[PDB]
Amino acid sequence: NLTVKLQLQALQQNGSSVLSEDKSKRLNTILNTMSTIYSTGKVCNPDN
Amino acid sequence: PQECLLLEPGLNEIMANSLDYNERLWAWESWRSEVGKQLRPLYEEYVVL
Numbered sequence: 001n002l003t004v005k006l007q008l009q010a011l012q013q014n015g016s017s018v019l020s021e022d023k024s025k026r027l028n029t030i031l032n033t034m035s036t037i038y039s040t041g042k043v044c045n046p047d048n
Numbered sequence: 049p050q051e052c053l054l055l056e057p058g059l060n061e062i063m064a065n066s067l068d069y070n071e072r073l074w075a076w077e078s079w080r081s082e083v084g085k086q087l088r089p090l091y092e093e094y095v096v097l
């Protein structure tokens with residue numbers, strides 16, 4: 001059946017977590033680092 | 049570099065509580081190298097007036 005095949009395929013995907021634990025933590029760290037740098041970066045005037 | 053400290057609540061607290069030679073040195077040096085360097089061309093002009 002195509003319907004149940006579609007559902008099971010949407011559900012079966014490993015996504016992340018197929019990595020090691022060191023690697024997965026390292027990845028989740030740089031994602032937040034990049035997002036935070038973008039969100040709170042600041043530039044300021046060359047004279048004041 | 050998204051962690052900027054002011055002098056009053058947070059720099060003279062590092063200088064007053066810490067015991068890490070490197071942390072104290074970073075604070076003492078950066079306060080003079082980043083703020084002291086802006087006051088020099090103003091003090092030289094204030095003396096004259």
Ligand SMILES: *[C@@H]1O[C@H](CO)[C@@H](O[C@@H]2O[C@H](CO)[C@@H](O)[C@H](O)[C@H]2NC(C)=O)[C@H](O)[C@H]1NC(C)=O
Pocket residue numbers: 001002003004
């Ligand atoms: C398997 O596929 C069939 C059709 O290929 C699905 O049959 C439908 O079932 C619904 C009710 O569940 C009916 O309203 C439709 O008329 C049926 N279609 C046909 C062409 O008869 C069946 O539902 C699928 N399996 C599951 C679990 O849904």
Ligand SMILES: *[C@@H]1O[C@H](CO)[C@@H](O[C@@H]2O[C@H](CO)[C@@H](O)[C@H](O)[C@H]2NC(C)=O)[C@H](O)[C@H]1NC(C)=O
Pocket residue numbers: 012013014018
């Ligand atoms: C999803 O990831 C698992 C590993 O975490 C893949 O490996 C299979 O995992 C199942 C469940 O433990 C074992 O029974 C199999 O022997 C494993 N090896 C295979 C199937 O070669 C799994 O293949 C991944 N699935 C998808 C769809 O990517």
